[PDB]
Design a protein around this ligand. Structure first.
Ligand SMILES: [K+]
Ligand SMILES: [K+]
Lengths: 247, 247
C-alpha cells in the first residue's frame, strides 16, 4: 500500500540470493533517517511476491558500542511465513546506516517505519565472491586494482567519482573480458551501494575467482557522510572505469 | 601568532610521548573542515616550546581508496629541526577526520591551513596500552567491559553519553583501584578523542596491563558524524562510568 519499492533481477532462475535494503525513519518526534541492509538469504519465491512480503515487516534498532565502533543491532519482526529464512537479528555499521545529519542515542531500542524497500536478486550464494574472499589469497602483491565508480546526481547535476578497492595482484592482466566486465558492471542498493561485476573467464585480474560468478564490492564505507536513501534515488550510475596502481 | 593551542601535561619528566592533533581548514573557496592526529612520537623538548614549533608546519592531504574504505594520506612539511622525529607521512580514517558536513574529492592533493593545535604529553610509548593490545590476549571471554563517557555541550546544553569498549574478560573484577581509575579517567584531543585510564595496580579488570601504565581508548569511531574541532572546544567531559555486560 503505497510503499516505494525497487526490484532488480540480476539472476534468472527459480532460486536466487535476495539482497534486501530498507530505507527507514525512526518513529520519533525528531526522527533519525537511516538505511538497513539484511544479510543475504536464499529464496525461491517470485521476486514480485517477495517484495510485497518484505514491505510488511516491523523493524527495531538499538545502537551499541563494539570493538570496531558504533553498531546497530537490527531486529526484524512481523515476518510472514514466506520470510521464515530471512535473518531476523543482525548487526550493521551505524555510521554507514545513519544519514549524514542523523544521530541515535546509545543503548535504547527504537522502532522504525519502513519508507522504501529494494530487492535485488543475485546468483546463488556460493557464486558470489567478495573483496575479503580475495585478500586472503594474495601473496607478495605489487599492485592494487581499483574500480572507479562514476555517478551523476540528477537533481543537483554534480558528478560523483568514488574509487573502490577490488584486489591486489603480483605483476596481460587487463584482459578484454576484464575490461568489458568493468565497463558493464552494475551498481545496486545493498550495503549502501554494491558494485556487481560478472566474471565469466577468470584469467588475469580475475584469477582465483570461480567461473560464472558475481564479484561483489561494498561501497558503503564511502557513503558514511551521505544519505543512502538520497543516493539510491538521486545518483545515476553513469560509468565504471578501473586503475591498476603500484602499491 | 594568534594560533589557538592547547597543551595538556599527563606525564611529568624530561621526556614524554607527544600526542598531537590539528584542526585544519582546506585552502579552498568551498573548504572542507577536518581534524588530523599525528602518530605518537617521543620528545624531550619543553612542551611550551614544542607547541610553538608544531604550529608552524605545513599540511597537505589526499583522499584515497583503501581495502577498509576512504583514507586520508597526510603529508607534513615545513618541520623545523626540533620536529625531526615527527612523522611526516601517514594515513588516517577520512570519515573520522572530516567534519559532519565536509567532503573531499578523491585522488587530489589539497593543502590545509592549521587553525588550532593540541599537544598532550603522555607516558613513554612502552607504558601505553591500547584496546587492540588486550584483545589479542583474551581467551574464552564471557563479558564485555564498557566505559561510559559523559559530556555536556556547554553551548547547546545537551548531554552526550558515549559507551566505548575497553576489553572482554572471563568471569572481584571491579577492584577499588579499577573503579577509581575509571572515575578519574581523562579525555584528551587525540584520535578524535582519547580516553586515558591510569593503571597502577593490575588486578582484576586490569589484568595483563603493565603496572604504572596508561590504558588509552580511541573514541574517534564514535565521532564520524561530529566536527572534532567543535567537540574538543564545546564538549566538557563531566564523568566516566563503566558497565560489565554479558557477551
Ligand atoms: K550514511
Ligand atoms: K568527523
Amino acid at each position: 500500500e503505497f510503499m516505494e519499492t525497487y526490484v532488480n533481477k540480476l539472476h534468472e532462475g527459480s532460486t536466487y540470493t535476495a539482497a534486501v535494503q530498507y530505507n527507514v525513519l525512526e518513529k520519533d518526534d525528531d526522527p533519525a533517517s537511516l538505511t538497513i541492509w539484511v544479510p543475504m538469504f536464499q529464496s525461491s519465491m517470485p521476486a514480485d511476491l517477495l517484495i510485497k512480503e518484505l514491505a510488511n515487516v516491523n523493524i527495531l534498532v538499538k545502537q551499541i558500542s563494539t570493538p570496531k565502533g558504533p553498531s546497530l543491532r537490527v531486529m526484524i519482526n512481523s515476518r510472514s511465513a514466506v520470510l521464515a529464512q530471512m535473518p531476523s537479528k543482525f548487526t550493521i555499521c551505524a555510521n554507514v546506516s545513519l544519514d549524514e545529519r542523523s544521530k541515535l542515542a546509545y543503548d535504547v531500542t527504537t522502532p522504525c517505519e519502513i519508507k522504501a524497500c529494494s530487492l535485488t536478486c543475485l546468483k546463488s550464494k556460493n557464486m558470489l565472491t567478495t573483496v575479503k574472499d580475495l585478500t586472503m589469497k594474495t601473496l607478495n602483491p605489487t599492485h592494487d586494482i581499483i574500480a572507479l565508480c562514476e555517478f551523476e546526481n540528477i537533481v543537483t547535476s554534480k558528478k560523483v567519482i568514488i574509487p573502490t578497492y577490488l584486489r591486489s595482484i603480483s605483476v596481460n592482466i587487463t584482459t578484454t573480458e576484464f575490461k568489458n566486465a568493468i565497463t558493464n558492471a552494475k551498481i545496486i542498493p545493498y550495503s549502501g551501494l554494491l558494485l556487481v561485476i560478472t566474471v565469466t573467464d577468470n584469467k588475469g585480474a580475475f584469477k582465483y575467482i570461480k567461473p560464472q560468478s558475481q564479484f561483489i564490492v561494498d561501497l558503503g564505507a564511502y557513503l558514511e557522510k551521505e544519505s543512502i536513501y538520497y543516493v539510491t534515488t538521486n545518483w545515476k550510475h553513469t560509468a565504471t572505469r578501473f586503475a591498476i596502481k603500484p602499491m
